[PDB]
Symmetry: D3
Subunit: 135 residues, 6 copies
């Protein structure tokens, strides 16, 4: 049983999709090991998006993730990392995400694609340690 | 922000899927700018299906779109044309439409595939013109 | 086979509950005989809310029903008038509407209780005539 | 605009109803101000259920609420206290809770009735301070 | 742990509500001990509706219950008899059944109220023995 | 108008997805011609899984389909065989099944992928005769 980090971004909260997103994870057979609504500091924001520090959008990216509260959660279970990714759908909600996925059913633009899931085992360890220090 | 035309065909109405189809459009983040239940003219049917006046089945086509009432609507929003197409699914409900789409979840045959969405920025204007002249 | 008038007020549209509300009517076994999204003129507002002409909130009632578009529909079927009322729930969404009804599941205040259904056969005949002249 | 405490008990978590319960609160128009999955210390459960300090069952009560993790949340909005109670339904899921409520749709016994909502303004203050010290 | 008999009448099957009705029983926490789609003989119909043999609507009752197939099931669990009744709702789908119940959400007339649940323990034993001999 | 066999395996029953799975078949436009909850004997299991007689997993594959009750059904309708397959999704619920399918939305491992549909016309005849002798 692996673990992955799931973030419900500000747009997901503003559109009242917290329960919907969690339900999909629960009915998939995965378990919620940690769940917390909280604000994000620039420090945490910077460290989460470290890999895009040079990129032009980095600026706006940090501004968004700090504009409102987010829901962070540790999802645990068999094939959890890949399962959450399958559930979420590709980055572009119209051209990459299939209908039936979170982004495919509810999103229109890449900027506001509601949720985040760790893209790999290596990535999951880093993200979980970062958001849930000591766990 | 674009606009597209959405038609809920007679089969969609007969199967009581009006609300279901609209809900999917609403939860996707798109807005309903125009909505109307109405009968279709033989005059209007031929103009909407003009690109088939030569083909064989043209007769049965006007017979079906006119056999009962339809719901016409103008869907508006970011990437609306492509989003509605994504939501509806491919023409063949079993071989082309993915599960999770309107056709994939509810239809069996191509003849009765419930809904219609403008295929492009070009036909959207044409179509929105015939069904909603002035808007 | 009676008929009743159903209005999805501006708050219902703003909250994207058009499909949800219609689905509930459809799954109840009733049929949508007429459906139209449209703006409300001050004249129509005044005639629809006639019985409240002399009341403190009459001016607010008119201003709300005119602040945005509404969806008007003619619902038809066995016990339609009483059925739509059952589906909608009492006026006060928290103290009168039971969970499971439209107001019970989605509303908080009486001012913004999303929908309207004719309260009687006499009232239905009057409202149908008023919103769908000739129908 | 009031605040109330909502607890999703161990049985609610074990049955994978976290998202379902939250969705109902969100669609009702209420907002989640605080959300956290956590274990309950017997020390905290004795203070939360301090009402039954003497009563017989009190022992097994702390054993159950302490047997697994719970989800605590601060629900905020107009008539929030009464709204959450309406949504949850009466204590006895079969004889008091109406269908359409959380207990009415998912529970069978009073012991395992899934959720908790503060019953009043004063009860809410006490509970929120207890579960979310300093807030 | 009691048992009760549940019948999904022909109208329930014709309207494609088999899964919906069963889902509600499952999510309530009850278990399906027996499930079978089958036709109803005039003999069995007479025995099932014995209570009404001297009435005017008796013939119509036998004719309807034998007009199509039905789904019979043995539902088992805590307070099963009362729970299934709660779930189904009163006999008159508009005046007695509350929204949120099977009849309240989907039915219009008493004649076609979709489902049946034994009204008591005495009745449960009789009906189960009748539909499921040797169970 | 073809026919196919559908099996809801023990894991599907244990997770209370009977109604959900059937609803998806019903809303797709297919009809349930036969439905039965029953236990499976080693004989039937061996006959059914005959294809994998000498494979390393054949042993446990018989132990599972025999560990609990299953729901067998004959689904009938246009393109029924391919439609049920589309609905169910690929064998691997995470890597092959698309979100929106039964396996995609609810399963994690191939061992416990909830349902079975005949993969071909030839296969359907054999399976139906086997599970529903004389029909």
């Amino acid at each position: 049983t692996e673990r992955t980090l799931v973030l419900i971004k500000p747009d997901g909260i503003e559109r009242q999709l917290i329960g919907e997103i969690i339900s999909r994870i629960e009915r998939k057979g995965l378990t919620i090991a940690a769940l917390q609504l909280r604000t994000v500091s620039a420090e945490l924001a910077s460290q989460h998006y470290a890999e895009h520090e040079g990129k032009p959008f980095f600026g706006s990216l940090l501004e968004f993730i700090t504009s409102g509260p987010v829901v962070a959660a540790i999802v645990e279970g068999t094939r959890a990392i890949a399962a959450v990714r399958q559930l979420a759908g590709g980055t572009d909600p119209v051209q990459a995400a299939a209908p039936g996925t979170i982004r495919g059913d509810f999103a229109l633009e890449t900027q506001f694609n509601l949720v985040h899931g760790s893209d790999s085992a290596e990535s999951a360890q880093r993200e979980i340690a970062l958001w849930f220090p000591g766990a």
